[PDB]
Design a protein around this nucleic acid. Structure first.
Ligand SMILES: [K+]
Ligand SMILES: [K+]
Ligand SMILES: [K+]
Ligand SMILES: [K+]
Ligand SMILES: [K+]
Ligand SMILES: [K+]
Ligand SMILES: [K+]
Ligand SMILES: [K+]
Ligand SMILES: [Mg+2]
Ligand SMILES: [Mg+2]
Ligand SMILES: [Mg+2]
Ligand SMILES: [Mg+2]
Ligand SMILES: [Mg+2]
Ligand SMILES: [Mg+2]
Ligand SMILES: [Mg+2]
Ligand SMILES: [Mg+2]
Ligand SMILES: [Mg+2]
Ligand SMILES: [Mg+2]
Ligand SMILES: [Mg+2]
Ligand SMILES: [Mg+2]
Ligand SMILES: [Mg+2]
Ligand SMILES: [Mg+2]
Ligand SMILES: [Mg+2]
Ligand SMILES: [Mg+2]
Ligand SMILES: [Mg+2]
Ligand SMILES: [Mg+2]
Ligand SMILES: [Mg+2]
Ligand SMILES: [Mg+2]
Lengths: 207, 49, 46, 163, 278, 160
RNA sequence: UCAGGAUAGCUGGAGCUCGCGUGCGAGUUCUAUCGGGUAAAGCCAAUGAUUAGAGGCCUCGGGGCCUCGACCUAUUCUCAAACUUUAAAUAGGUAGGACGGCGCGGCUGCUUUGUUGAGCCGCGCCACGGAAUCAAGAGCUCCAAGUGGGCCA
RNA sequence: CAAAGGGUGUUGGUCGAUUAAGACAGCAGC
RNA sequence: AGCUCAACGAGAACAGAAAUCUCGUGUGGAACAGAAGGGUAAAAGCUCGUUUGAUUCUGAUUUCCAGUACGAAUACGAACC
RNA sequence: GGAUGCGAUCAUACCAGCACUAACGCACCGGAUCCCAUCAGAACUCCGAAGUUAAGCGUGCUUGGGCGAGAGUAGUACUAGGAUGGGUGACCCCCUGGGAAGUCCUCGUGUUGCAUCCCU
């Protein structure tokens, strides 16, 4: 059946995505990229830990789903069904070809994989500070599902936002944070003045 | 390219040596043959000998 | 089938040869109306 | 011919610039071209007549003929071990007056007067330009010194904006 | 339901503005390009345009040549200065256009110091005219630039063209659009064309109202009546005007842009007022 | 705001009769407009062939005519008189226009009445030179059209 | 036509025309100027692909006033050899005088409303060589061999 | 030619915790 | 020469998701015989008017390239339209 | 200081909303005999001068969108040359050089030629 992952581990060809030129591509194995309590507010899960790739390699869609399932199961048991939010940060958009002599050897589409780079985040989990140990352990199990070498890095940012935890509290105390579900919006000093609210108008940018 | 520049510097044989005035035109030529040459600032003794 | 290997080396053995440039260039292919008048101007030049 | 059409591989070269399509400004049609002037060939994608082959795009040549709507341009072309003088006619929409010799005329006049001012006083000089030479010695007044040291490594900072 | 905004950020990012004169609706650049583009083997040979423009109450005529810095005016003539020559009313009719074109032709020839060699048409009979070349000098040549108006038969612009031709200027043209030309007969009726040159059509309408609608005549021609001009006296007036033309042809009220300091100060006041609300 | 140049007026009246098929019916329908309006109507052609409606592309399926001036007012009151000087609140478009339809009126044909209201100065958007946009404050709004209909014909607007 | 041949390139021989550093030449740089759409980047820009919530919830459908999905607004994860606003490094073209410049005259059937232009011609005057480095020199012609299976980094 | 993954083999380093107010092991009755 | 397209919004007897008509917005999201790319908005698109430069005579140039031919294209000259 | 005619540069000039303008203009505007024009004097064309600055045109404003410039992103990404450099490999450090682009932040919102006329 499917070839061993070593055959297409190295990035050797240009990107070959599904398009009007490449037809008959099988669907990716992974279809769900967010698991757990994905509706929790930005203020609920301050902690964030990433599983970061340390190699330049192809990661099959089959391995991505396996890592998500393995990480999801342990975190659910260890911490609970409503104590974490796991997000897969990589999407397989590259199509792999297979040549089933060498005359006309251009292969047919076999499957899909993701072209990962060095330092690129593979998986992200946000939860409360009390479940930091469980989150790191869950990512450790998922590491065995990937072909290359990964690394566990604890983020200094508030959940999935782009603000540092110190900055998030600094802005929130100043009333410059407008929750947007999992995201956080920072209020500046631009736009129509009438659009702002009495307590949400500022003269200087948030610096 | 290196072959042409070394010819313009009159360095056609290993361990041959020449003087060269310093200006942006000559320095940029020298930069393009860096691994094939070594150079520096000669003192009065060296020039005399 | 094809390759440009060694072709630049061959070209530089005796090249690159720039064409000889003369003070006066050929008038072939220039506007005949301009050329015809110029011929008459030289004819009556004194 | 022989596997490639006249405009093959001109998707980017012959396309107009972003937000610079439509009517051609009329300063293009008010330019004056004389024999001996230098012009840069830049194909305008909207004008399909008198347009040069893709090779001559981005090349500078010398004007050798002038017609009602086009200028004859001489362009060098390297073929194997020779340089050929290719004479082509191009509509003026595809040519821009080149500033490759803009300094020559003004430089000659300055050289002529400098030599004239030196001839009257019997002082032989040279008007040649020279490349940037070495700087002379000088003193720099002391000021506060900011110390630079290597920074301790932090893995969290190995990403744009950090992890 | 809610409709998607048509003019989003993406719409403005990719929007290319047309030329300022085009989006102001005043210049047809297709026509302008073909009017000023000179043969390159003629080098710096100006191509003069006979620009004729009609406003709601005035006629503007100019001799124009193009340059990189902009258009250069060689000579100009306004219908509003015809009262200096005698014409007081109807400064936008066919006859006035003929007078304006005649005035420009004599002025430009005066400036070029060649008005003596070319006196123009001495017998204005409504027939097509073209000044014959002189002995030691060709007539001044210009091209008609009608602008954005419709080039219909009997248009005022061609009345000014006739005046310029009768003034001694060489202007390429045909008779297919002069007043009096017939689509079916494909001939120019000199009598009808001469009628329009001297305002005969205006005089005919004045007499028609008097016999039928005297009340309408008083209002429709109030300025004509105010200056004692009758329908039968218009032809003599224009003939007199034509002869006269050949004889001799800061406080600020708009606001000023606020300075940066003034604009910032007002912004602070609005910001504080909004914050103090609620 | 009370300037005489802000007075609303009927720009034109358009009578559309979409018979939906060519032949004798369209010819008879056109004659109705010509006598009712006093000018030759225009024959509209189908943009796309539709088998459900039974119309082929580039086939004359409708006829309309544009009327301006006194006859527009004379022919507009007759339509409103048949309508009993009552219109629905939704019959007025946001761009200061309204219309109605009669089904009694060769034969009997149903007509489509649409009225365009404009203030003086709309030429700026219709002229060829210096074509511009009418100022927002000077445009006829939905509210303005309703008030004009309630004072010109003292009609009633039924929200329903 | 594909184990071949001719053709051009590469090569030899024969010279010839000049030149001796004042060279007008260069698989180099410098100065000035011109062209580009790869690398990267971009989607929080068009086109295409694609994850998630948030608000509004007007209007449409879905089911059971509720309700899910469509919708609209502001955000968000991740992408493109045959996508792209932007955009390198390297490489590509042109120019840096005696074939220059100025002054006064002349020629024309071309050109101009116009001895107005355009090009050319004659005379006079000026022109320290008009970036660096190198230059076992530069140009021109004739006759002809071999070769037209390549391979390696 | 060698991999993922492992070692209370040994040698450096990084972060944290405990300790003369008595830790740790054992012993003794927290 | 005049005109502006795709689409959407708001309106009108039969008439509806979709016939025709009206206003508004509309950078081309249409159209331009065919593949794809490029190009085009008072146009190169759409609708009308007049028409046959889809004409006659050479030579030159570009692309191909041996700097041969053919095909195709471009800039002029001399005629007739 | 401006307007108008013809323009050059083609958004710092565009788009949206709000506000304002002396004089001369430019407009809207009145009419349909004649030329011309359509289903339609709406447009186009012709003739005219009662009315109005309501609109257009012009100017100003907006913690407006866009556009333009700077800063920053960042000596980061990438890249020319070098090594009997590291590493199982993937890849990467160092040496001689070159060197970007979104987000975020600040600022700006046209300039100008010829002619005529008003302010005079
Ligand atoms: K692993
Ligand atoms: K191909
Ligand atoms: K980018
Ligand atoms: K996108
Ligand atoms: K051979
Ligand atoms: K160890
Ligand atoms: K046209
Ligand atoms: K429309
Ligand atoms: Mg096996
Ligand atoms: Mg491959
Ligand atoms: Mg062949
Ligand atoms: Mg080939
Ligand atoms: Mg063609
Ligand atoms: Mg035209
Ligand atoms: Mg053999
Ligand atoms: Mg041979
Ligand atoms: Mg460059
Ligand atoms: Mg390419
Ligand atoms: Mg590309
Ligand atoms: Mg890339
Ligand atoms: Mg063989
Ligand atoms: Mg072979
Ligand atoms: Mg190991
Ligand atoms: Mg196409
Ligand atoms: Mg052809
Ligand atoms: Mg009217
Ligand atoms: Mg106003
Ligand atoms: Mg802004």
């Amino acid at each position: 059946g499917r070839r061993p992952a070593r055959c297409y581990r190295q990035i050797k060809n240009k990107p070959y995505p599904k398009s009007r030129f490449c037809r008959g591509v099988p669907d990716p194995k992974i279809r769900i990229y967010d698991v757990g309590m994905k509706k929790k507010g930005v203020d609920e899960f301050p902690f964030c830990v990433h599983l970061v790739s340390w190699e330049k390699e192809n990661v099959s869609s089959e391995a991505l789903e396996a890592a998500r399932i393995a990480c999801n199961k342990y975190m659910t048991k260890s911490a609970g069904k409503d104590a974490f939010h796991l997000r897969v940060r990589v999407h397989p958009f590259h199509v792999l070809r297979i040549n089933k002599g060498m005359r006309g050897a251009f292969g047919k589409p076999q499957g899909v994989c993701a072209r990962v780079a060095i330092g690129q985040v593979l998986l992200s989990v946000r939860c409360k500070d009390g479940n930091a140990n469980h989150a790191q352990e869950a990512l450790r199990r998922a590491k065995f599902k990937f072909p290359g070498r990964q690394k566990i890095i604890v983020s200094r940012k508030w959940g999935f936002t782009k603000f540092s935890r110190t900055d998030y509290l600094k802005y929130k105390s100043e009333n410059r944070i407008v929750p947007d579900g999992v995201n956080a919006k920072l209020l500046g000093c631009h736009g129509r003045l009438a659009a702002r609210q009495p307590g949400r108008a500022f003269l200087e940018a948030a610096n | 390219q290196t072959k042409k520049i070394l010819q313009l510097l009159r360095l056609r044989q290993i361990f041959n040596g020449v003087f060269l005035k310093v200006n942006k035109a000559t320095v940029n030529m020298l930069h393009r043959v860096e691994p094939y040459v070594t150079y520096g600032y000669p003192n009065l003794k060296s020039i005399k000998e | 089938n094809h390759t440009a290997h060694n072709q630049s080396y061959k070209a530089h053995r005796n090249g690159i040869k720039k064409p000889k440039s003369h003070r006066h260039s050929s008038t072939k292919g220039m506007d005949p109306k301009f050329l015809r008048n110029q011929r008459y101007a030289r004819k009556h030049n004194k | 011919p022989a596997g490639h059409g006249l405009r093959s591989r001109t998707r980017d070269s012959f396309s107009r610039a972003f937000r610079k399509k439509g009517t051609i400004a009329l300063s293009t049609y008010l330019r004056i071209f004389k024999i001996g002037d230098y012009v840069d060939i830049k194909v305008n994608g909207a004008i399909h007549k008198g347009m040069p082959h893709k090779f001559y795009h981005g090349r500078t040549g010398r004007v050798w003929n002038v017609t009602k709507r086009a200028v004859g341009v001489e362009v060098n072309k390297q073929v194997r071990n020779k340089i050929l003088r290719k004479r082509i006619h191009v509509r003026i929409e595809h040519v821009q007056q080149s500033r490759c010799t803009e300094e020559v005329r003004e430089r000659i006049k300055k050289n002529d007067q400098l030599k004239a001012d030196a001839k009257a006083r019997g002082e032989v000089i040279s008007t040649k330009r020279q490349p940037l030479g070495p700087k002379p010695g000088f003193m720099v007044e002391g000021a506060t010194l900011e110390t630079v040291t290597p920074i301790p490594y932090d893995v969290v900072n190995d990403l744009k904006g950090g992890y | 339901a809610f409709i998607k905004v048509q003019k989003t950020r993406a719409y403005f990012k990719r929007f290319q503005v047309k030329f300022k004169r085009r989006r102001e609706g005043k210049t047809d650049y297709r026509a302008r390009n073909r009017l000023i583009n000179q043969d390159k083997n003629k080098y710096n040979t100006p191509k003069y345009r006979f620009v004729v423009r009609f406003t709601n109450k005035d006629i503007i005529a100019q001799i124009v040549s193009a340059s990189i810095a902009g258009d250069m005016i060689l000579a100009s003539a306004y219908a509003n200065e015809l009262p200096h020559y005698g014409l007081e009313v109807g400064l936008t009719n066919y006859a006035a256009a003929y007078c304006t074109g005649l005035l420009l032709a004599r002025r430009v020839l005066k400036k070029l110091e060649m008005d003596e060699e070319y006196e123009g048409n001495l017998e204005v009979n409504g027939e097509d005219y073209s000044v014959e070349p002189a002995e030691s000098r060709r007539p001044f040549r210009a091209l008609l630039d009608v602008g954005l108006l419709r080039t219909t038969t009997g248009n005022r612009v061609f009345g000014a063209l006739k005046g310029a031709l009768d003034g001694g200027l060489d202007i390429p043209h045909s008779e297919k659009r002069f007043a009096g030309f017939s689509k079916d007969s494909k001939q120019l009726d000199a009598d009808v064309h001469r009628k329009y040159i001297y305002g005969g059509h205006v005089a005919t309408y004045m007499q028609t109202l008097i016999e039928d609608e005297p009340e309408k005549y008083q209002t429709h021609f109030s300025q004509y009546i105010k200056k004692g001009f009758e329908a039968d006296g218009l032809e003599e007036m224009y003939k007199k005007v034509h002869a006269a033309i050949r004889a001799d042809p800061h406080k600020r009220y708009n606001l000023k842009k606020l300075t940066y300091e003034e604009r910032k100060a007002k912004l602070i006041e609005r910001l504080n007022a909004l914050n103090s609300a609620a | 705001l009370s300037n005489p140049m802000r007075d609303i007026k009927v720009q034109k009246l358009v009578l559309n009769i979409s018979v939906g098929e060519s032949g004798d019916r369209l010819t008879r329908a056109a004659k109705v407009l010509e006598q009712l309006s006093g000018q030759s109507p225009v024959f509209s052609k189908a943009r796309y062939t539709v088998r459900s409606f039974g119309i082929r592309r580039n086939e004359k399926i409708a006829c309309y005519v544009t009327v301006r001036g006194e006859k527009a007012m004379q022919l507009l009151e007759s339509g409103l008189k048949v309508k009993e000087y009552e219109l629905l609140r939704r019959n007025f478009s946001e761009t200061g226009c309204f219309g109605f339809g009669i089904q009694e009126h060769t034969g009997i044909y149903g007509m489509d009445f649409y009225v365009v209201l404009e203030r003086p100065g709309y030429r700026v958007a219709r002229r060829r030179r210096c074509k511009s946009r009418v100022g927002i404050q000077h445009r006829v709004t939905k509210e303005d059209s309703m008030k004009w209909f309630q004072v010109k014909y003292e009609g009633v607007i039924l929200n329903k």
